[PDB]
Amino acid sequence: AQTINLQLEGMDCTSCASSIERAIAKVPGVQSCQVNFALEQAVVSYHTPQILTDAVERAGYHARVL
Ligand SMILES: [Mg+2]
Ligand SMILES: [Zn+2]
């Protein structure tokens, strides 16, 4: 698995973190996604990174590959 780190913008509450996690986990091949709420970052283990940023954008939040 490859590790992809994302900066996240637009999170207001811990339920924004679980929403972003759900959105990313819906992408086939994601083997783990954990959003660090305080760091406003996602750590994704994936089996291009732009499919992951699009999952976040489609869920209503901004992501950027780090
Ligand atoms: Mg930014
Ligand atoms: Zn929220």
Nearest ligand (C-alpha, residue 12): 2
Check the annotation: does 13 bind a ligand.
yes
The total of other beta-carbon atoms located within 10 Å of residue 42's CB is: 26
Domain span at residue 29 reads 1-66
User: Phi first, then psi: what are they for 9, rounded to 5°?
Assistant: -125, 150
Count how many domains the chain has. 1
18's tokens? 């679980």
How was this model experimentally determined?
A: X-ray
CA distance 24 to 52: 6
Neighbours of ion ligand 2 (CB under 5 A): 12-13, 15-16
Could you tell me where the beta strands, DSSP code E, fall in 2-66? 2-9, 30-36, 41-46, 62-65
CATH at 3: 3.30.70.100
Name 4's Cβ contacts closer than 8 Å, sequence gap at least 6: 43, 44, 46, 49, 52, 65
Resolution in A: 1.4
CA distance 64 to 23: 15
Q: At 14, is the secondary structure helix, strand, or coil?
A: helix
Check the annotation: does 33 bind a ligand.
no
